[PDB]
Structure formats: structure tokens, C-alpha cells
Design a protein around this ligand. Structure first.
Ligand SMILES: Cc1ccncc1NC(=O)Cc1cccc(F)c1
Ligand SMILES: Cc1ccncc1NC(=O)Cc1cccc(F)c1
Lengths: 304, 304
């Protein structure tokens, strides 16, 4: 009973957080095995951020310039390399708390947990969706760079995000763990356009199924629609077009509740055209798109 | 930039979760030092839950009947005692992962993180407010009993909640770590009334300050009010009456933003009387009351 914006337990990730300092800039690093991963802008001063030549900036740095502290113990840096927008600092000690892990590049619309950190210390954890425009609407302040996003499948942590930058609009941009930015962003102090964003249709449908499972059913109606008809409504309301791939992943929720996907689409169509009329769904007065069909199944079945 | 429903990092609590089985009932326990705490209803069968005599039920149990498993290792139970609605199983081994901790009884309106668990394994973490009526609107299924609520101040975990029961309305009831229920609830399979709930006024005001800090300011107006006038509006809209104690704890947010508490009360009054007019505040289309003034200061300053 109940449905919450649940994050993964952050324990396995907390054991990997370190503080990385280079010159006068300090941020977070991720220590996995004998490598520490962090945003490459740790090598920059504020003046460098205007138009940085990272290759030239990194050349002025040696292993001893990167100070890596795991809690209260100092790591010895024996190598450094830049891969895309991340630095990889080889250390002489493998992290004893390294969980089983993978580096994954998630798709837009997928969700993950963020462990916000400052000075290598965890401050909090929250669940995010990677927006269709490849930004995240996180909660990050100066010093949070290097904080990571992740998912967990039983004992394996799949790291998918490393925080790098705050856009002038207050939304967030970052990379996968190979240092490739999600979206068009560059790690430079320049105003950068995020694409037009859209609402993640398949996620709103999954959340409507979660609402029905938990008893919030007032929005169910006597109607049905087609993918074509629904997509005309999705276009008008800036929702992602629904595809058969999306219908396919909603199958488990359709089977559990007995509500055909296109019937739920008709409820969503009516909610888009008429609003909530002052009512709520799962404690929300808007259509929530930060739960994937997998998240709904996982939470509604109590997967650990 | 940004403001999220952030939970504490759950790592220190994950290290304390164990599975407790007695007869054919399995639930979660909390292993701190050499004691395992769990809901006393682990000793009941479904038939016992109708009208249980816990004292008589516990008398039929011996130390060897309580099976406590921490991950994959078995704990040896050398004592058992019932304290209010919790069982305390003395074990022969102190939990090596015991963090610095305290047991606290929180007040209604205060917030905390829940680490939802099943079979002793963590499934997810979310931030909750203890409702003014002493229920929590959690996300819990069968097997989640024994999952705990907590806050963290630097290195100290203050445990404040242990999950026990789901009311017929789908809201949740539990105890402090001494086994005293929050609210009027009893651990019995009987329909039980939760009091009339109210919105946590001081928290909505704190969240309005968080919105102003992050740039959502459309709701600020040219008006002011008094505690008496605001409280007439709070009464009409089922909000908690605001006191000078509440105004006092909003002081840091009033000082940071330069918006006097009674001026923010006038914005809240107008929002109550006119609604959001289809607009949002911090990604919400309703007035959020699950962030305390302390949570707002902590998140807006990045406290670890
Ligand atoms: C101040 C802040 C707040 C939240 N998240 C991140 C930040 N910090 C930055 O964006 C620094 C920065 C500037 C320009 C490029 C870059 F890659 C990184
Ligand atoms: C089924 C479920 C779902 C979520 N949270 C909890 C539960 N389980 C219960 O309430 C069991 C129960 C019954 C009667 C009394 C009691 F103290 C405990």
C-alpha cells in the first residue's frame, strides 16, 4: 500500500565516494577498484572555466597534484588520464568497499538515484529521471560535481551519471562514467541551450497503473483510444509519442490490473484535455513522469 | 539549484538490517550492538492477529525459536524480551557495522527517511513526514514490517520509527524504537481510526522559502497578514495553527531571503484561497508539507 518516489539504498555507493582536490578546486570522486573517477574540471581555476583547454591544463599537473582523500585516509596517485570529460586517477590501493558494478549509458526517460555529495561526503539521496532533453532536474550546489547517478540490480551497481554542471536555467548536466556528456553540453562556463523537453509518456502511463494498483481510480473512464489518436493528443500537450515498444513494456502492468494499455491511454488523454479538476493521484496534482514501468513493477512487488 | 524530496544516505542503516523468523512469520529486524529489535507480531500466526495475547504468545517461544540472519550469517539468540510492541533479541555478537546511534521519539510534523526492507534486504529509501495524526504515508507491502525510519546528524543515526502495520485505508502505523506506537494504534487485525489529519503549516512555509531560494517566486504578493488572521484561513483549510514557535524556526529562512514570516504567510493565505491557477512550485501542483525548516536549510546549504 502506498507509492513513493523511492531511491535505491545508497550504501554501496557511499563506500565509493572520495574527495579530490587539485590546486584550489575540490570536488567528489568515485573510487572503484584502483581507479578514482572525477569531473575533469577539478584541474581548472574559475578563470580557466571560461574557455578551458583541458589537454593543456592537464599537462601542467602531475600525480602528486591530485589529492584524493577517502574519509580521513589519503590515497596515493600513481597515474592520471583524461577520458572525454572525466579524469581517471590510478591509485595504489583497490577500494575494499568496491561493490560489483558496471558503467552504463542510460537512455532518456530512464530513472536513477543520485547520491548528492560535498567534499567526498554523502548529503542525501533522491530519485531522478534523465529528461528527454538529457538534462536532470536535480538538487545540486557548488561542490556537488562528481556526485553519481546509479541503479542497482540485486548486488550490482550500474553507474550511469556523474554530475558536472549547472546550466543558467538551474537544471543539471553530466556525463556517463566514460566522461561522455548526456546531451549537447560542454564543460565550459558558457550559456548552453538544453533542447525542448517533453513529458515521458510511458512513465506517466506506468504511474497511472501504479495509482490503480494502490486504489486511486477516479480517472478511469468508459473510453478507449488508438496509438494514432493518442499521439495527436501527445503532440498537442508536449508528450513523447507512444510506440508499440512502450506498449510492450507496459504489458506486465496491463496484465496485473486487467486494464488494456490503450484504455489507460484514453484515461491519460482525458486527463490531458481536462486536467485533474482539483483532484490528486498518488498525492500529486500533476501527471508524474519519473517512474518507469520497471520501477512500478519493482516497487509494487517489493524487489530487493 | 533545484530542490528535491531528499532522503538521508541509507548506508549506516543498511548495515543494521537483519531478517527475523519465528515459526512461519518472517520480517525485518534492526541489529545494533548485541541486540536485534523487531515488531513483536513476528511471534503471531495470521489467526493470532485477530486478538493477540502477546504475553501468552511469547511464553510459548524460546531463544532458539527466533532465527536471525544477517545477510547469509546466522546470529545466536541468547535472550529475548518484549518492550511495549517490540521484541529485543539479545545476540552473542555485536554488529560490527553498528553506527553511532540514538533512539528518538519524533514529534508529529517532523520528517525522516525510511529504508524499506523485505526479508532483511533493503529495497529502497524515501523521505516521509510523520503526519499530525501519527500515521505515515509510506510505501510498504507484506514483509516490510521492521523497516525503520531515521535521521542522521553527521555520524549519528537517530532511529525514530519502526514499521508495524497497514491500516485498512492504506496508510501506515508504527512505533518508536522502545515499541511505543505513534498515535492510538494497537498491533491487532482490527479496523482502527486514524485522527483527522491536517497540513503541516510550518513545513509548507519552509517549502515556500525553498521555492523563493530556487527562483520560483510567482506566488509572492504585495500583502501581509497577522498570526490571528492567517490562523482563521488555516482553520478553514485544515492547516495546523501557526504559533510563534513555528515563526521562530522559520527565522533563518526569513533572514536568508529577506521575506518576513508574516509576509510569506500572506502568500500562503492567497495560495489557499485562490489555488495555484494551473501553475507549479518546485515541480509540484500542490502545497508540499514534507520538508521541515531544518530540511530546507540543510538542503539549501549542502550539509553532509
Ligand atoms: C555551481 C554548481 C551548482 C550545481 N551543480 C554544479 C555547479 N558547478 C558548476 O556548474 C561548475 C562548472 C562550470 C562550468 C562548466 C562546468 F563543467 C562546471
Ligand atoms: C500487509 C502489510 C502491508 C504494509 N505494511 C504492513 C503490512 N502488514 C501488517 O499490517 C500486518 C499486521 C496486521 C495487524 C496488526 C499488525 F501490527 C500488523
Amino acid at each position: 500500500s502506498g507509492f513513493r518516489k523511492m531511491a535505491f539504498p545508497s550504501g554501496k555507493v557511499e563506500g565509493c565516494m572520495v574527495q579530490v582536490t587539485c590546486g584550489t578546486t575540490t570536488l567528489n570522486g568515485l573510487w572503484l577498484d584502483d581507479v578514482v573517477y572525477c569531473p575533469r574540471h577539478v584541474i581548472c581555476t574559475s578563470e580557466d572555466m571560461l574557455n578551458p583547454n583541458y589537454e593543456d591544463l592537464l599537462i601542467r599537473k602531475s600525480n602528486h597534484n591530485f589529492l584524493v582523500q577517502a574519509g580521513n585516509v589519503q590515497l596515493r596517485v600513481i597515474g592520471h588520464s583524461m577520458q572525454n570529460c572525466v579524469l581517471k586517477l590510478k591509485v595504489d590501493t583497490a577500494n575494499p568497499k568496491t561493490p560489483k558494478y558496471k558503467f552504463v549509458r542510460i537512455q532518456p526517460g530512464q530513472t536513477f538515484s543520485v547520491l548528492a555529495c560535498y567534499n567526498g561526503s554523502p548529503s542525501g539521496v533522491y530519485q531522478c529521471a534523465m529528461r528527454p532533453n538529457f538534462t536532470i532536474k536535480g538538487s545540486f550546489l557548488n561542490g556537488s560535481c562528481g556526485s553519481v547517478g546509479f541503479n542497482i540490480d540485486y548486488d550490482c551497481v550500474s553507474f550511469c551519471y556523474m554530475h558536472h554542471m549547472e546550466l543558467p536555467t538551474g537544471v543539471h548536466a553530466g556525463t556517463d562514467l566514460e566522461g561522455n556528456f548526456y546531451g549537447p553540453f560542454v564543460d565550459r562556463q558558457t550559456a548552453q541551450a538544453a533542447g525542448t523537453d517533453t513529458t515521458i509518456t510511458v512513465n506517466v502511463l506506468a504511474w497511472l497503473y501504479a495509482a490503480v494498483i494502490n486504489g486511486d481510480r477516479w480517472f478511469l473512464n468508459r473510453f478507449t483510444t488508438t496509438l494514432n489518436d493518442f499521439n495527436l493528443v501527445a503532440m498537442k500537450y508536449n508528450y513523447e509519442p507512444l510506440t508499440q515498444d512502450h506498449v510492450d513494456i507496459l504489458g506486465p502492468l496491463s496484465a496485473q490490473t486487467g486494464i488494456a494499455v490503450l484504455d489507460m491511454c484514453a484515461s491519460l488523454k482525458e486527463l490531458l484535455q481536462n486536467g485533474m479538476n482539483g483532484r490528486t493521484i498518488l498525492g500529486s496534482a500533476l501527471l508524474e513522469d519519473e517512474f518507469t514501468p520497471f520501477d512500478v513493477v519493482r516497487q509494487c512487488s517489493g524487489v530487493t
